[PDB]
């Protein structure tokens, strides 16, 4: 459950 950006990937 990290606070990473779930939409970081441009592809």
């Amino acid at each position: 459950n990290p606070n990473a950006n779930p939409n970081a990937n441009p592809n």
Partner: antibody
Amino acid sequence: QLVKSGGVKPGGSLRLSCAVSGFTFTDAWMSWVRQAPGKGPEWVGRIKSNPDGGTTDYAAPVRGRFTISRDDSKNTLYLQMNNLKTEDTAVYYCITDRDFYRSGGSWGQGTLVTVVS
Amino acid sequence: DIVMTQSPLSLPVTPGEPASISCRSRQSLLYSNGDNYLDWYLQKPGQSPQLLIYLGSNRAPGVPDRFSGSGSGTDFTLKISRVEAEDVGVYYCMQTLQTPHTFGQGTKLEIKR
């Protein structure tokens, strides 16, 4: 496309502005990173997009002194630096993830902040 | 914090020869959607860092095919199939899974001309 501007003594303040061009800033999460001379980069803080809550996270050495904000009207990211320390001296960069991965390239020129006493 | 460890710290390589750099994390960088939240950078002398690989294995635009990124979870590898003179600089890993975002200590590549 990023252009950093606005970059000074111990205890004083300085505001960095990073005007963004080349993608839709409103939907981009943004980070400040810095690199003191002779050392590797160090993450300073991040601000989510306002549609995702627009909340902020800060590196421990700057928590309580620095404030990150954004004006989506101007496609501009800000770093308000207060109560500056000499150890804050570094080149500061504004970065993002998805739009940067898509375009490639470097972090740009960055702006040197020298805390002088 | 997530400590990132890079190996080796210094990497002398003869032009044309292959180079491999390792970055190891204490915490898995695998996110719930299958992506690994690790980027690879090159900082050429006097320049700002340049993105080489994003999210584990995606070669960024403008990067020659000589560069490739592999790995998953806690162990990642940047590979340079053939080293050129322009490749000299300091290579950095960077995890973005969890704040504070953190960087490897850096790997200085040295061209053995």
